[PDB]
Design a protein around this ligand. Structure first.
Ligand SMILES: [Mg+2]
Ligand SMILES: [Mg+2]
Lengths: 103, 121, 159, 43, 49, 51, 177
RNA sequence: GUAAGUUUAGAUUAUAGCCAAAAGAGGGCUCUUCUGGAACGGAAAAAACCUUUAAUAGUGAAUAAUUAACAAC
């Protein structure tokens, strides 16, 4: 219990100095979540599409217009309406076809 | 009119407590100064600009070795406020021809003649 | 009630809580035991990928085997020639890490790299702002570059 | 040189194994709760 | 480099946090110690020459 | 490319004479939203094998 | 570690739901905490271009507290845009009309003055009292410590605690009291 | 302590300053004398105050100045 940080969340910390005093050794094994700290999976009722569809239920006038649709989308994702509007063709043609990819 | 200033001599007469505070003996005075520029001569009068170039302190935070003799001290008093004066100290003695290439000036003001870059052990 | 006793109040005690450090004697025994355990892990080879923090050129690089580093200057090494990185500040594994003060000993860590490419940077435009700026008062800076592939990070039981 | 195009390089360092101990996610450094009870949950 | 360890080596970064807090506590004790107390285990400086 | 990874896992643990894993909900965030995060840990003999 | 590409990315940039209790709390201290989580400044992966903010739920905003005489001295000003449309309201008056307004306005000023501030305010959920919609409760991940430790009232103090504190002075027998 | 100076040969441009701080004289201006300044940092925006020896490439580091300050027997 020499560590100054609790060992119960991320990892156990053991700090030690080598006898010479020129190295600092840290032993940090990970902590596993105890079984008693977990919940059973809710087996009774799933693809993320199904969850999306229920949130964006088509109720009024069959397909909604841009205005009503955008307000429905904004509430579901906690965004503003402005994000969902399109852009003109100057901006669309500026977008790179093949952006660089890192790993 | 802004003009060159003459400091009263009492400023440079130390007190017994000063020797204890700075740890310098009034006898056996140190021989060489370590002087670094720590302020800019911009916005300072031209006479202060001149001495800084005479003393070699054009670059800031780069130490210059100077003689602890009255004539040099007179110039240093002109720019006292723009510099830090530190006594050069020789724990292991003056560098010789053999050790001239192995010296190092420490921040403490000590010129060591053997610099190894190894743990003291 | 002892002398200089103040009843508990809002300002009687400092906001912070004083902590009691373990006595040095017991800690040193535990310190040696901790070091011994880690040394066995190194000795028995109970580790996977290693990552090291290395001081090369003027910069520090978090490094792991198969990694690529770009150095913004010429190095004087032929392409394909293997090198040892000698200033390691940290070597780490899944379960342990070793910290230098400030540098780890050569006995512990050996980091090897290879020169893969010697190149130049793309043209960088250096144009200052001045009266009558003009379009031709322009400088192009191209700097030699070196690319190093980290090959191995190895540790030995010499704690 | 290699034939790779001489253009701006975004990062001076490339690695396919950036992490050994696990990449940080918001639950790392969060302690679990008995029975996995979320705050204000009665049980 | 400290950012790279925080994002990609969380277990190592926790060790650094414990080491930093460990040294910080020693400094608090040292100031109250007045110099009579011996120096902390992690507060020792490896000299070079 | 392996489909039904749970079925494979079950077979492997049987070969090791290990008990069938029990799935449980370790960490949970924003379940009722459209962007939920779930951590599920497979527990064998009340011991965590994978999350 | 050892996750597939997409699940790892999803976990790292997932957004968390935090709970703040505002009872007997200064709005500014609540604002500092909330403004930190809303921006995502609590994450090592924070970037201004990453939209890594979190959801903050603040309850009991009706029961916030001000130091000093800020209830009567702090004034909120608005203009409708028409001649004579300038309004100045004290903190108490604004609190009476809307219990939630004071907390929202303190947080609004603390967020960066850019377009993303409007998006961040969508993730802020302010409830005047302890009651929360069931769905918001289920999202919650963690509660945050109250920034201000609330002093105890006399009645709250236990009988044992009272005895622990010394009786500094003694009233004389011949006193009305 | 330091590296400039004098002389010979040739040559234009310039010959309306601005602001800050000192000392005067006319009486806030208006003059004369002496010092400093012309950020890419700071003082909110900020020619003139303060920090700043030139010019560079780097996903390094130590720093400078740094608009804030804590009612009565
Ligand atoms: Mg010009
Ligand atoms: Mg400031």
């Amino acid at each position: 219990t020499y560590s100054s940080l609790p060992d119960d969340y991320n990892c156990q910390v053991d700090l030690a100095l080598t006898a010479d005093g020129r190295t600092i050794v840290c032993y940090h094994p990970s902590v596993d979540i105890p079984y008693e700290h977990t919940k059973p999976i809710p087996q009774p009722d799933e693809t993320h599409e199904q969850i999306l569809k229920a949130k964006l239920e088509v109720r009024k006038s069959k397909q909604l217009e841009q205005g009503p649709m955008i307000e429905q989308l904004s509430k579901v994702f906690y965004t503003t309406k402005h994000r969902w509007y399109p852009h003109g063709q100057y901006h669309n043609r500026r977008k790179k076809l093949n952006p660089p990819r890192d790993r | 009119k802004f003009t060159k200033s003459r400091i009263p001599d009492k400023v440079f007469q130390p007190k017994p407590e000063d020797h204890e505070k700075y740890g310098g003996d009034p006898q056996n005075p140190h021989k060489l100064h370590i002087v670094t520029r720590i302020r800019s001569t911009k916005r300072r009068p031209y006479w202060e600009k001149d001495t800084i170039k005479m003393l070699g302190l054009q670059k800031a935070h780069s130490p210059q070795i100077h003689k602890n003799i009255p004539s040099v001290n007179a110039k240093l008093k002109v720019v006292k406020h723009l510099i830090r004066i530190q006594p050069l100290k020789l724990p292991q003695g003056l560098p010789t021809e053999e050790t001239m290439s192995s010296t190092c000036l420490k921040s403490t003001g000590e010129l060591v003649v053997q610099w190894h870059l190894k743990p003291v052990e | 009630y002892p002398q200089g006793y103040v009843p508990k109040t809002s300002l009687s005690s400092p906001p912070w809580q004083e902590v009691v450090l373990p006595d040095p004697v017991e800690e040193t025994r535990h310190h040696a035991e901790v070091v011994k355990r880690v040394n066995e892990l190194i000795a028995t080879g109970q580790y996977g990928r290693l990552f090291a923090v290395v001081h090369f050129a003027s910069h520090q690089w978090k490094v792991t085997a198969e990694d690529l580093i770009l150095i913004e200057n010429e190095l004087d090494i032929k392409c394909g020639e293997r090198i040892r990185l000698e200033k390691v500040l940290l070597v780490g594994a899944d379960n342990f890490t070793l910290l230098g003060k400030p540098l780890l000993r050569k006995e512990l860590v050996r980091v090897e790299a290879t020169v893969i490419e010697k190149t130049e940077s793309w043209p960088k435009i250096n144009m200052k702002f001045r009266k009558r700026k003009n379009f031709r008062k322009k400088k192009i800076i191209v700097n030699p570059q070196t690319i190093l592939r980290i090959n191995t990070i190895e540790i030995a039981p010499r704690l | 040189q290699s034939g790779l195009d001489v253009i701006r390089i975004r990062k001076p360092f490339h690695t396919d194994n950036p992490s050994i101990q696990g990449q940080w996610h918001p639950f790392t450094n969060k302690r679990t709760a008995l029975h996995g009870l979320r705050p204000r949950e009665l049980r | 480099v400290l950012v790279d360890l925080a994002i990609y080596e969380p277990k190592t970064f926790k060790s650094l946090a414990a080491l930093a807090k460990r040294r910080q506590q020693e400094g608090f004790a040292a100031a109250l110690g007045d110099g009579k107390e011996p120096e902390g285990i992690f507060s020792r400086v490896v000299q070079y020459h | 490319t392996v489909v039904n990874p749970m079925g494979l896992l079950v077979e492997e643990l049987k070969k090791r004479n290990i008990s069938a894993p029990e799935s449980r909900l370790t960490r949970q965030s924003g379940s009722t939203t459209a962007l939920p995060l779930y951590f599920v840990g497979l527990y064998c003999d009340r011991k965590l094998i994978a999350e | 570690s050892s996750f597939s590409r997409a699940p790892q990315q999803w976990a790292t940039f997932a957004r968390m739901w935090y709970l703040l209790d505002g009872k007997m709390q200064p709005p500014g201290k609540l604002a500092v905490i909330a403004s930190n989580k809303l921006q995502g400044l609590n994450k090592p992966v924070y970037h201004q271009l990453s939209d890594c903010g979190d959801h903050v739920v603040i309850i009991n905003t009706r029961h916030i507290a001000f130091s000093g005489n800020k209830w009567e001295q702090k004034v909120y000003s608005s203009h409708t845009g028409y001649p004579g449309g300038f309004r100045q309201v004290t903190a108490a008056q604004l609190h009476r009309k809307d219990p939630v307004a004071i907390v929202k306005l303190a947080i609004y000023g603390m967020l960066p003055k850019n377009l993303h501030r409007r998006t961040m305010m969508q993730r802020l959920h302010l409830f005047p009292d302890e009651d929360i919609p069931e769905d918001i409760l289920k999202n919650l991940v963690e509660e945050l410590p109250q920034p201000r430790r609330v002093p105890k009232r006399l009645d709250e103090y236990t009988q044992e605690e009272i005895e622990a504190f010394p009786r500094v002075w003694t009233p004389p027998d011949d006193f009305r009291m």
